Design a protein around this ligand. Sequence first.
Ligand SMILES: CO[C@H]1O[C@H](CO)[C@@H](O)[C@H](O)[C@@H]1O[C@H]1O[C@H](CO)[C@@H](O)[C@H](O)[C@@H]1O
Ligand SMILES: CO[C@H]1O[C@H](CO)[C@@H](O)[C@H](O)[C@@H]1O[C@H]1O[C@H](CO)[C@@H](O)[C@H](O)[C@@H]1O
Ligand SMILES: [Ca+2]
Ligand SMILES: [Ca+2]
Ligand SMILES: [Mn+2]
Ligand SMILES: [Mn+2]
Lengths: 240, 240
Amino acid sequence: QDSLSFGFPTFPSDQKNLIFQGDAQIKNNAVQLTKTDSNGNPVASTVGRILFSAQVHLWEKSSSRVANFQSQFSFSLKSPLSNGADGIAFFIAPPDTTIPSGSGGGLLGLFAPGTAQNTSANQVIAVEFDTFYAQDSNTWDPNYPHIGIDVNSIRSVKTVKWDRRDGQSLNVLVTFNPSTRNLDVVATYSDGTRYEVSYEVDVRSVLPEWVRVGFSAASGEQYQTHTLESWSFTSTLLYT
Amino acid sequence: QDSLSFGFPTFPSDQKNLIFQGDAQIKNNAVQLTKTDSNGNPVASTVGRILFSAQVHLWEKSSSRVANFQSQFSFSLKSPLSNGADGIAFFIAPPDTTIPSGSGGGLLGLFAPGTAQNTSANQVIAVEFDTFYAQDSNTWDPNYPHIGIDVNSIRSVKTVKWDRRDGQSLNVLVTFNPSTRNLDVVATYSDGTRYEVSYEVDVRSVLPEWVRVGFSAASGEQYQTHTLESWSFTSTLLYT
Ligand SMILES: CO[C@H]1O[C@H](CO)[C@@H](O)[C@H](O)[C@@H]1O[C@H]1O[C@H](CO)[C@@H](O)[C@H](O)[C@@H]1O
Ligand SMILES: CO[C@H]1O[C@H](CO)[C@@H](O)[C@H](O)[C@@H]1O[C@H]1O[C@H](CO)[C@@H](O)[C@H](O)[C@@H]1O
Ligand SMILES: [Ca+2]
Ligand SMILES: [Ca+2]
Ligand SMILES: [Mn+2]
Ligand SMILES: [Mn+2]
């Protein structure tokens, strides 16, 4: 289909079109990307992702068309620790994408350690909300919580300072305009605090024509819950 | 998802979210539901159906919601004969639905011979465009070409006289309003010739909460191509 869209105002446990990977599972009408104990408390060493089952037609070689897509979603992180980790990410990858071996912790369940920074070894575009930046383990991160745009590497091609607010929902709008090739990210907290980051990227050179969209999150030694509360997505092929 | 929509202005051969059953396949950016030979002519004894991969949330028992859906599509029928058979049908059925054994010909690939008219043995709502009505083989049909609304039976609960035009595309709009429970069908040829048929049906008592939508076509001894040219679909769960 040239156009596809779906909306999850909430996530009832009765799901049919979501591909759950790792520890990801539905709880309290929300997606708990990372594992939590019987008390709903976050635990260490956990990775989880969800993908919408239907493949998205990102671009079409034959018609020279590229998709105009928008992904609106909200999530919240919670942790009794002063340094909750590791972060959540909205990502776009090949349809057969699975959790890479050893992709936990700072790699957000998106990259394998050996090629995490090899842009030629990956095919993924992701908007990460990174809360752990310990300069000894996450050597690639700026020294502070941030929102980053990842293109075939865990080393964001771009980051903007971000504030982590325990238990507060962040509303995020990620849009891609094929005309300008601008990938825009706008995130806001309920008090009006706003964060914006944009990047020009030709998705045609990074991802295959058909892809799957979803979220990923992980916790290494430090942990926190990564709760996806809602998600709406829409894409439509346009001439360029 | 509470809401889902997809649109196929045409049907390129590189499909990822379509379940093809029987003889259905893509040809010339269109879906040929029934089998055709090398030179593109319709053949006898052929059944074919397609279903969108993503399951549709037709209704939700917990929230007492029923989806409002709209299915817009166009098709054309071509046949060297002028007794082309048997017709095409838009249908909604449980997710695991498959072509019933012996559902060819007048059964449109939707029902099994032994239960074709047993309403309690089926789970399917279809909008058929029936071109073959020989009373000896299709004993359940009115004696003329017709558009029918099928609810768990090949014997339409409601029909309207229809005109088969060889090679001409029929534009169809199928809508279900959960508020009034009316399933409305509007079909028009490019020249404005219009056909309407509607029926009140509580989809909750007929279909499970999650379903799959698609098309089915078949030709018995009489044949014709059943060419699905375009299809857009959208459903949104609503409170009433
Ligand atoms: C101390 O470093 C680990 O934890 C931090 C914070 O969670 C991560 O950012 C970092 O990637 C490290 O996690 C790795 O090591 C963990 C312990 O072996 C393991 O559980 C993780 O999956 C990851 O490999
Ligand atoms: C006896 O009529 C056959 O053809 C008409 C017109 O195509 C159908 O409406 C009717 O169902 C009959 O088709 C059946 O028999 C065919 C030959 O045995 C078979 O190919 C069909 O699948 C169907 O069973
Ligand atoms: Ca990090
Ligand atoms: Ca018939
Ligand atoms: Mn980072
Ligand atoms: Mn009929």
